[PDB]
Design a protein around this nucleic acid. Structure first.
Ligand SMILES: [Ca+2]
Ligand SMILES: [Ca+2]
Ligand SMILES: [Ca+2]
Ligand SMILES: [Ca+2]
Ligand SMILES: [Zn+2]
Ligand SMILES: [Zn+2]
Lengths: 614, 351, 615, 351
DNA sequence: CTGCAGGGTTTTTGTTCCAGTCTGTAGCACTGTGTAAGACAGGCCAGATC
DNA sequence: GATCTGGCCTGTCTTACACAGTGCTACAGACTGGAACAAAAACCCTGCAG
């Protein structure tokens, strides 16, 4: 006879121990033999391995998280970080938080009030500092925050209409916030370089990249202007005796995820007056900071800083604007060489870089006074297109994104052209170009899987550069010489294109850079011969620059692409999404909010706490 | 004395509120343009032609020995009457730079040759200032006097950005009245000397003053130190004694609280004052006229021409006399979408 | 020699097994020899007893909550709900998910796959059923999902085009979905009634109200209608003398959280063609539904269900446009009686209810044949304005909201005419009327602090029909006689405003209903005495209705605010919020998604989790 | 053969892509308006005016003994030739209602009297049909014939939904063609008879046909079953013998692959096609004269009027003939915002 | 006793395969397909006078 | 009246300006078993190094 065997997990713990005592002794003595009496860890490990044999990873992770410490709640930092990282309203966050708190709470998330404090150490206007020498014509107050861009603008109706609403910070405070953020990583790099952390702490060097682009369709577009900056690369000279050591160069400056906005204004990008009226103070204070030095408690030590500023992150027309170049298809084609448009057909490579800010100021004054009584367009010639007193100094360089987009549309256009005929039909009519573009996009669609676009898009250009689209379309070409010729041109382009796309070719790929002059010469002369009909004397500007200035600027300023305004443009999406669903509909405060929210979006503190081990 | 709804055919986007309208040798010339001069016309000035409520703007060209002028925004204007040795001049100083800056520089503008084919040559000369020079200001008021019997230029008024020491980046767009000094200048030589006035309490702006036969009459304007608009005009007489240009002033107790009005000279010294702003919101809608005299102001309010609901409703306005009892005014317009001629235009005339 | 051996918990699981192989196979063979080969239960009990030996009761109880207790955070349900309850898109949800997973390990939330499948538990077409008798002219397929409203609309351009984009659910399916949702509270009402559950499985009584109302300002064609409906209550008819005991009764019917959409189409409210062409099958199933008995596994028990409906949720305009009457301002205004225009002014208190959908059909037939060979206006009069064929049965009831809106605008222009003196000046002028408009605007801007609007919202109405607004504007009308007149007017009006605005007037203001007859008659006679100036023979239809129809309808049905349709209006805001945020966006998918989201938005099985654990 | 674009002044919404025209003694009346009548036009029929390119509409009234008629959409239309007993009827049956349902009812339309001032009185008599009555259907065809010398009227064609037994909530707009069966009808009394033919392999719809002198030609349309537009011709020789009106038919070599065209009359049996649809996606666009004779049908291509690029680029087009070789058509207007006149309008003619 | 190279040790750690499965991340249809400003070239042309 | 020409017109060119984030789907990567295998991490162990 006997008692029937029931399920082991249903009887009392008395019967459990009864039926398991033998294996309990086995596990006890095994733990004592192999690990010295650790029954708990041995039974734990065996249970976990038995669970994982069935591929039940989830419950094993659950139980292990319950053991060896816990994750009951959350730190407030990552909480607010996540909140801003997915563009939620305070109402939303509260509903969700109260909800989950009601359910197995154990309140994990955190309520709003604690968040809305936990960031004043991240938002600007919070960290004490000072300068030596003092900043000229600049308040020493280290506490101020969001300021309406009006700059104490007299509301006087009789005078200039004081109309536009704007917001911004004080440039210095944004810089020092950026530093105090990166401080953890500058200390990390100090340790990586193993240099002393106590001394050699007064001669750092921070590279600043400024940038500004307009942005339409922000509702009439309402066409508001965005202005941003970014820390590019911080170096150190101390204690001297050397050139400088880059502690932290940004790895992905292209990414908008490291691009902090500084000033927002509800104005068009073209109207110069209001633009200046709200930009002047900023450029003035930047010029002021160029001389003095900053003092900040970083790494517990009162260290010091000086800076260097690169005016790159801009479109062409704006550069011309705040430089005073006659936008855009002027007789003076290049911002950086002074050649004529026409003469840029005879020569296309040998060109020097002399266009510098103060020089342009001098040339403008020589325009104004005309110390030579010379004729009007004569004055235009001698000044070399300098007739508009500029104010904003910029680094004389081009953006990668725009060179790419312009050369992409040039490619697209010439493809539509030579699908029809140019050197066998000299003067084509408008409907001809229309039908040629239609059938060109037909070819680009049937294979290569691209849909047409009203304007040039970035990834659109990326695919527009693939040789495979060329092999697809050029099949439509009747010629063989010109067909394989445009193939070879695409070839040269692919060979020498990533040169400016590169982050640092001197470290990425010096090869093409060494023969960049040579391939540029090849392609330039191939165009001059096989396509003189189209480029007799008229030249797209970006092509002039890339065929007459790329290697020099690459040699001078570290690299290119590392300064493209591309990340600026990307931020528009942010400013789009932000304006969509995180505000009360009030203008005086819409920017006052959107700034705060967006300024959050860029923090290695926050971004790291967001990655959290991938 | 009535209006007419004009229409500017093209270029209806190159007109900010503040600009100048200079009349010499017949045709009228617009100075001051939104944004820097395009290559369409480098010298920026435009000859105005009014035809059938339509507005044509012809480009201008200078001499070769001339100088080039930035489009000063709310500058000081002076008609130097035709007399020896170079009739007949305009004087522009010192204005607001389109790129937001100031220029204490003084400009003498004149006409040189014409046409042959109706294209009229102009010229501009930077008249250097020695002093005791006037600081860079805007909205100030300068005119010309001929006392026993020689000719000088009197400047007063105008605001200025905070001094270059208290220039606060957060107050950068603040601007207060310049110190109240009159500036007496000979065009040649530029012996610009300043003079105090113990009765002139402070500076001011938009006070469209006037001088007659070396006797000046400052009608009240705006005082930002007080936000007040004391109507009373202030008379004064300047006497070009050798070599001290002695001065006298007098507090006329009755004037007019007006800011930046339009004054068309009708007679030799008969001036109709069209309109401006008596308040921050209440614009001077009523017309005005003063005959000038050794007795001085002799004021009558003419019949104010009818006003379209358009000009009634817009927040503000601006304009200037086309000369000869005639003027042009503009209204910041609306439209959905942008017209983009952001201003509607109206001619106005006397009699 | 030998390498120092580390702590078992820190080794690699490969090396952990490499070194534990002995006891691993020992526990394996112990399970196989003694416990039927269940290694999992063996090691579970090993860890459990080892922990409980060290006084680790808290960790042991938490582990026992993990094994055979669904831990792993909280639930798939609340996860999906919170996803809905704040309109969060999927990429965002996954971004938060991976984040809270990496930092603060032991993920609480569910991944995407879990909630995708969990949908089909609350999507329509998941619980099986059938009809007795079988549903006529209806496919018996029960597992179907979303269908575009074309109902086989052949796309022949030769014929009328299929240019209309529409989506819908199958009516019965959303019905059974909502019921199976509310099986929880139906079992709980059975509980509260202390009522049997094995018995009384046949005599359930379910009543649903419905609505349909388009809206403009949908662009960047242009318009769409959101046809919806919601259960109201459910009682018990078994087994005799007991007429019915409300088992469930809705508490917030006017609320948005009780508004179940069924079909949406990119159409205007006006063109009667497309509306019928789409909604036809809905009408057919509606009428085919009254008869058969539905079988549902409610509370695990297969029980029968029957249904009564009362069409209420329609504005006056749509009410008419599905009744074929004169739209809108013709001599026939009472959608219930056959009053003329001036007769509603002649007598303003003595009217009965006559307009009955069946009689509407019957008299449209008279229009059709004219069996008496009568003239156009002659037959129109004899037929009492039965001008078209009726199309769908609605209960001859009233909308409280827009009737209040009519009271509001009427008293508004009363004020606009009393600031001026119309009883002295019987023909004032347009511009003087606009000046009286602007002075009324500034008057109510100073007092009561209200801004002007070109078209009015409900808050404007309620804040206008206030004695404080009366005495604020009365300061402008100089005649202290007219002041007291319209003061007592507003007084007696508010003496009855809650009567129709009551959710349960039988309880919320029964004495207010009792004297309603006298109050309304006083209203009409005061009109005739002092305000006849305006109401000689012209009135507004809504007033007519609030005068001679309120008590009849409410006594016959129970309330008005109960059958009020308000929700759909503000729910249009929700429809917009949904579309512009969660759209695909693709026309064939825009609705095909927003409908899902929307239907999800209104399950008590979710909303309780917002209020259930909150109080 | 000319087209001229028209613009209707005070009518821009009442017509729908499927509608009809009816002429009685040169007088044109539009039939079929969008939705039920408003308070404006309780009849829905409009006397049409086309004068100096402008299109006006006016409302009509009826007698009292005349019952009114809901706005059918695509019925079969048949002009009863004016003869004993009652001239001059014009037949209406049976189309589909505004509520997407079908009539399956026979109405006779007639004139009663006039005027006074260009006013015309009309009448509608619903006559019950005895049978063996046809089922509800739409898009069908019916015409009159005489057999020495009896008068009959025969119908065939049309689409309809699935029978109510399989009528499915998801097929509620699915439709198929009618069975290939004709129905002969004496007008007095309202007798109806159904008949099938062995050559009649399949039903159809949308098809136009012409009857004359006891024989009819059934012309091209499209069949949904095989999705084909068979360009054959049908021709039935029919006669009325007491009391069995026997009926024979034949298939000619070729008819035409056209779908739902605009047929104008010019002579007794000289008619013209202004194009229907050749392909489901591609419109046939040219004209085609067709006479029918006792010898047979005789068809010839013609010169198509010079189509506007817009009418060339419409996706749809439709209408009827104003009569006597003149027709009117409309095109869905494309614009955001809409004009909101949903259709351009054109007037076409021959010779 | 030191020095280092390298003899042994057990213990990480991956190492090979055939079936899964649970997940996260990639790929996707997709809106809409012209704008707006200014430079400069030249075409023409009125107006005005030579 | 001739002309011519200063200027206005029309056209063509060149540089910015919009289209991404979204639910759905499919695949890939990431995990379970046995054997027996190299390669290392670091103790210890020996041998040759003074
Ligand atoms: Ca740009
Ligand atoms: Ca850009
Ligand atoms: Ca409404
Ligand atoms: Ca409405
Ligand atoms: Zn260059
Ligand atoms: Zn009634």
């Amino acid at each position: 006879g006997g008692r029937p065997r029931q399920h082991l997990l249903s009887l009392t713990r008395r019967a459990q121990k009864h039926r398991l005592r033998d294996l309990k002794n086995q596990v006890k003595t095994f733990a004592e033999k192999e690990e010295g009496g650790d029954v708990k860890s041995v039974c734990l490990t065996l249970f976990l391995l038995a669970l994982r044999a069935g591929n039940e990873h989830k419950q094993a992770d659950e139980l292990e998280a319950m053991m060896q410490g816990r994750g009951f709640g959350l730190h407030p930092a990552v909480c607010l970080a996540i909140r801003v990282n997915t563009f939620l309203s305070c109402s939303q966050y509260h509903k969700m938080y109260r909800t989950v708190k009601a359910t197995s709470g154990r309140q994990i998330f955190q309520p709003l009030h604690t968040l809305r404090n936990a960031e004043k150490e991240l938002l600007p206007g919070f960290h004490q500092f000072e300068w030596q020498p003092a900043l000229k014509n600049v308040s020493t107050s280290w506490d101020v925050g969001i300021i309406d861009g009006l700059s104490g603008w007299t509301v006087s109706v009789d005078d200039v209409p004081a109309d536009t609403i704007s917001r911004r910070f004080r440039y210095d405070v944004a810089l020092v916030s950026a530093l105090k953020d990166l401080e953890e990583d500058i200390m990390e790099g100090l340790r990586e370089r193993a240099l002393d952390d106590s001394m050699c702490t007064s001669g750092f060097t921070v590279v600043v990249k400024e940038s500004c682009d307009g942005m339409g369709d922000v509702s009439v577009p309402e066409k508001a202007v965005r202005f941003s900056f970014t820390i590019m690369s911080i170096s150190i000279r101390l204690e001297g005796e050397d050139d400088g050591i880059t502690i932290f160069q940004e790895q992905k400056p292209n990414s908008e995820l490291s691009c902090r906005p500084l000033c927002l204004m509800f104005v068009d990008e073209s109207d110069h007056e209001t633009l200046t009226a709200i930009l002047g103070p900023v450029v003035a204070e930047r010029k002021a900071m160029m001389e003095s030095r900053l003092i900040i408690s970083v790494g517990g030590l009162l260290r010091s800083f000086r800076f260097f500023f690169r005016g790159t992150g801009y479109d062409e027309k704006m550069v011309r604007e705040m430089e005073g170049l006659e936008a855009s298809g002027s007789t003076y084609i290049c911002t950086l060489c002074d050649s004529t448009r026409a003469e840029a057909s005879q020569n296309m490579v040998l060109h020097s870089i002399t266009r510098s800010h103060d020089e342009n100021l001098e040339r403008y004054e020589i325009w104004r006074k005309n110390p030579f009584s010379e004729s009007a367009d004569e004055l235009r010639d001698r000044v070399k297109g300098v007739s508009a007193k500029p104010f904003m100094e910029t680094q004389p360089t081009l953006d990668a994104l725009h060179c790419d987009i312009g050369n992409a549309t040039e490619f697209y256009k010439i493809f539509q052209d030579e699908i029809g005929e140019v050197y066998q039909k000299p003067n084509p009519s408008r409907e001809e170009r229309r039908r040629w573009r239609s059938t060109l996009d037909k070819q680009l669609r049937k294979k290569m899987k691209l849909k047409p676009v009203m304007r040039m898009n970035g990834n659109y250009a990326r695919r527009l550069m693939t040789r495979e689209a060329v092999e697809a379309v050029c099949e439509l070409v009747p010629s063989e010489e010109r067909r394989e010729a445009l193939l070879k041109l695409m070839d040269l382009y692919l060979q020498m294109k990533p040169v400016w796309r590169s982050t640092c070719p001197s470290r990425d790929c010096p090869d093409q850079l060494c023969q960049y002059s040579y391939n540029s010469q090849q392609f330039a002369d191939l165009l001059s011969s096989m396509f003189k009909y189209r480029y007799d004397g008229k030249i797209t500007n970006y092509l002039h620059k890339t065929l007459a200035h790329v290697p020099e600027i690459v040699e001078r300023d570290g690299s290119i692409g590392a300064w493209a305004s591309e990340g600026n443009e990307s931020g528009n999406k942010l400013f789009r999404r932000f304006r969509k669903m995180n505000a009360r509909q009030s203008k005086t405060f819409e920017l006052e909010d959107i700034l705060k929210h967006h300024w959050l979006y860029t923090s290695k503190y926050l971004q790291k706490f967001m990655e959290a081990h991938k | 004395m009535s209006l007419q709804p004009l229409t500017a055919v093209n270029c209806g986007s190159l007109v900010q509120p503040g600009f100048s309208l200079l009349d010499l040798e017949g045709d009228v010339y617009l100075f001051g343009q939104k944004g820097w001069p395009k290559r369409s016309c480098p010298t920026g000035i435009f000859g105005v032609r009014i035809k059938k409520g339509e507005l044509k703007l012809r480009a201008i060209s200078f001499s070769n020995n001339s100088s080039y002028l930035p489009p000063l925004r709310c500058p000081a204007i002076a008609h130097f009457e035709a007399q020896d040795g170079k009739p007949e001049c305009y004087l522009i100083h010192g204005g607001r730079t389109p790129n937001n800056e100031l220029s204490s520089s003084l400009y003498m503008l004149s006409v040189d040759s014409r046409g042959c084919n109706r294209k009229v040559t102009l010229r501009c000369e930077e008249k250097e200032l020695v002093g005791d020079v006037p600081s860079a200001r805007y909205g100030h008021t300068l005119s010309v006097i001929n006392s026993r019997g020689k000719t000088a230029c009197v400047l007063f008024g105008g605001r200025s950005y905070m001094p270059p020491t208290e220039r606060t980046t957060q107050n950068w767009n603040s601007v207060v009245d310049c110190p109240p000094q009159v500036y007496l200048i000979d065009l040649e030589f530029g012996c610009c000397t300043a003079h105090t006035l113990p009765e002139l309490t402070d500076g001011q702006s938009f006070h469209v003053a006037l001088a007659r036969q070396d006797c000046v009459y400052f009608l009240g304007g705006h005082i930002l130190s007080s936000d007040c608009r004391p109507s009373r005009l202030i008379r004064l007489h300047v006497e070009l004694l050798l070599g001290s240009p002695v001065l006298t002033c007098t507090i006329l107790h009755e004037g007019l609280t007006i800011t930046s009005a339009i004054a068309s000279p009708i007679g030799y010294h008969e001036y109709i004052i069209f309109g401006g702003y008596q308040s921050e919101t209440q614009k001077r809608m009523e017309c005005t006229y003063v005959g000038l005299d050794d007795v001085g102001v002799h004021m009558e309010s003419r019949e104010p021409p009818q006003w379209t609901s358009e000009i009634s409703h817009s927040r503000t306005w601006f304009g200037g006399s086309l000369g000869k009892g005639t003027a042009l005014v503009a209204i910041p317009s609306e439209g959905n979408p942008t017209p983009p001629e952001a201003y509607h235009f109206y001619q106005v005339s006397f009699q």
